[PDB]
Design an enzyme around this catalytic site. Structure first.
Site, mmCIF file in Angstrom:
data_model
loop_
_atom_site.group_PDB
_atom_site.id
_atom_site.type_symbol
_atom_site.label_atom_id
_atom_site.label_comp_id
_atom_site.label_asym_id
_atom_site.label_seq_id
_atom_site.Cartn_x
_atom_site.Cartn_y
_atom_site.Cartn_z
ATOM 1 C CD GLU A 204 -5.962 -0.767 1.213
ATOM 2 O OE1 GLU A 204 -5.747 -1.870 0.665
ATOM 3 O OE2 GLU A 204 -6.799 0.027 0.767
ATOM 4 C CD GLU A 382 -5.786 3.499 -1.430
ATOM 5 O OE1 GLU A 382 -6.487 2.582 -1.965
ATOM 6 O OE2 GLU A 382 -4.580 3.336 -1.111
#
Ligand SMILES: c1ccc2[nH]ccc2c1
Ligand SMILES: [Cl-]
Ligand SMILES: [Cl-]
Ligand SMILES: [Cl-]
Length: 484
Positions: A204, A382
């Site tokens: 991220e 995720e």
């Protein structure tokens, strides 16, 4: 039943800063993140919760118990990171022209790797080897990620930057960080390639840039509000990925990917499809076009950026609703990640403990969008929900797994599903209150409990399918009995 390919793996993702500490000898005080969450002014401002990571779930010491539970759950894949700060806690000598904006090459060779090795913390390296060996001994496929947000303090003093002093270690605002990160990544692949199945450079990167320098109410370091510096950080993080990719490939033949924070952009009305496209360009395509196609804006192609990606890791939690405006588009509160906690969105869909809307269809959207544009294989790295009570998670889990099945059926090459997370952990600025685990953690005793969703996931993983008996969970949690 919804059956998955025989090679498809179910498992989990975890981060070092969020899960490692909590047991004897585990504390890592040498990161920007540790300094940031301990800072008295940040605590007084409510930028951070006051909860401290050293009181966490204790994976550093209790990893065998985590792994035992994963093994019993039928899991076959794991994605974990090394913490840079543990391996190189001390400043390295300055190397290299820092005023140079572009970093097009970072040379890796055996002599340099051996010299770096002299500076490495051997206790930490050995301990990671013990953890990863234990993991591989459970038959788990291993994705090693190099970077999951905290930086060594000698590369980033976030309180100095928060204060507007740019004369010290400034993290992603400095090409020094880019240089050292490439060397760090090559070094870790050099040391652990025998245990690793696939690599990711980072997790991220868009959040680092976006929340660190724009979404400053979020409590992400260094919390310095600046559009210009957000751009500088992202530009650097992009070249750091490319130099890390090249560095790993100088010592390993294994696949190297990246993990990204995604949302599914959805139109408020049928007139807002152009808003959706703009939002996808601005949140997703600009970044991947850079590291896949080498396309950046100075519009040019950088030969040193092009082709630096083997696979894509999709992190997905919820949608973002957008509408066309005069000057472009805006995202709307009351949907997606901008809802009230434990309530309903403006669409009547239930929201989590974090205020995130139930929207599994968005995962199909994101997977198929990436596939159609780049045709690179993916992992869902995720997907999860803040839900201590476990009211929604059974539905959340089954529903999102179904959408991955749909995506594969549509042609997308998706090779695994990794839930966030196996156990509750330290959720950054929110502290321990937001509980994402299949397993509930008692932080006083470090004891792990199975939420009923963990039993559901065992049924999925052990059968390699959503089995007939749990297919009713491919649905929205009933809203009538929930807070609203
Ligand atoms: C708290 C919140 C966000 C963070 N990103 C990196 C460290 C860290 C700590
Ligand atoms: Cl996205
Ligand atoms: Cl392409
Ligand atoms: Cl607790």
């Amino acid at each position: 039943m919804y059956s998955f390919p025989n090679s498809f793996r179910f498992g989990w993702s975890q981060a070092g800063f969020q899960s490692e500490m909590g047991t004897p000898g585990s504390e890592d005080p040498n990161t920007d993140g540790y300094k940031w969450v301990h800072d008295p002014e940040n605590m007084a401002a409510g930028l951070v919760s006051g909860d401290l990571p050293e009181n966490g779930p204790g994976y550093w010491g209790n990893y065998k118990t985590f792994h035992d539970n994963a093994q019993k759950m039928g899991l076959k894949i794991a994605r974990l990171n090394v913490e840079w700060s543990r391996i190189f806690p001390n400043p390295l000598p300055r190397p290299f022209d820092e005023s140079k904006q572009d970093v097009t090459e970072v040379e890796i060779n055996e002599n340099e790797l051996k010299r770096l090795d002299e500076y490495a913390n051997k206790d930490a390296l050995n301990h990671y080897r013990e953890i990863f060996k234990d993991l591989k001994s459970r038959g788990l496929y291993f994705i090693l990620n190099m970077y999951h947000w905290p930086l060594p303090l000698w590369l980033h003093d976030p309180i100095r930057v928060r204060r507007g002093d740019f004369t010290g270690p400034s993290g992603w605002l400095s090409t020094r960080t880019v240089y050292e990160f490439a060397r760090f990544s090559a070094y870790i692949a050099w040391k652990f390639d025998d245990l690793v199945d696939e690599y990711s450079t980072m997790n991220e990167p868009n959040v680092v840039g976006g929340l660190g320098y724009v979404g400053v109410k979020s409590g992400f370091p260094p919390g310095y509000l600046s559009f210009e510096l957000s751009r500088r950080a992202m530009y650097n993080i992009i070249q750091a990925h490319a130099r890390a990719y090249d560095g790993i490939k100088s010592v390993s033949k294994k696949p190297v990917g990246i993990i990204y924070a995604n949302s599914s952009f959805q139109p408020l009305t049928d007139k807002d499809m152009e808003a959706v496209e703009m939002a996808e360009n601005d949140n997703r395509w600009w970044f991947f076009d850079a590291i896949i196609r080498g396309e950046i804006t100075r519009k040019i192609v950088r030969d040193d950026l092009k082709g630096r990606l083997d696979w894509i890791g999709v992190n997905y939690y919820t949608r973002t609703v957008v509408k066309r405006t005069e000057k472009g588009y805006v995202s709307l509160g009351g949907y997606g990640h901008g809802c009230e906690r434990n309530s309903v969105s403006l669409a009547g869909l239930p929201t989590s403990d974090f205020g995130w809307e139930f929207f599994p269809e968005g995962l199909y959207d994101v997977l198929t969008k990436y596939w159609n544009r780049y045709h690179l294989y993916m992992y869902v790295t995720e997907n999860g929900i803040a839900d201590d009570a476990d009211y929604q998670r059974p539905y959340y889990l089954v529903s999102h797994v179904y959408q991955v099945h749909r995506a594969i059926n549509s042609g997308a090459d998706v090779r695994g599903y990794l839930h966030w997370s196996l156990a509750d952990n330290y959720e950054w600025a929110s502290g321990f209150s937001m509980r994402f685990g299949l397993l509930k953690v008692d932080y006083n005793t470090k004891r792990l409990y199975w939420r009923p969703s963990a039993l559901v996931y065992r049924e999925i993983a052990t059968n390699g399918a959503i089995t007939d008996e749990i297919e009713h969970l491919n649905s929205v949690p009933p809203v009538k009995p929930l807070r609203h």
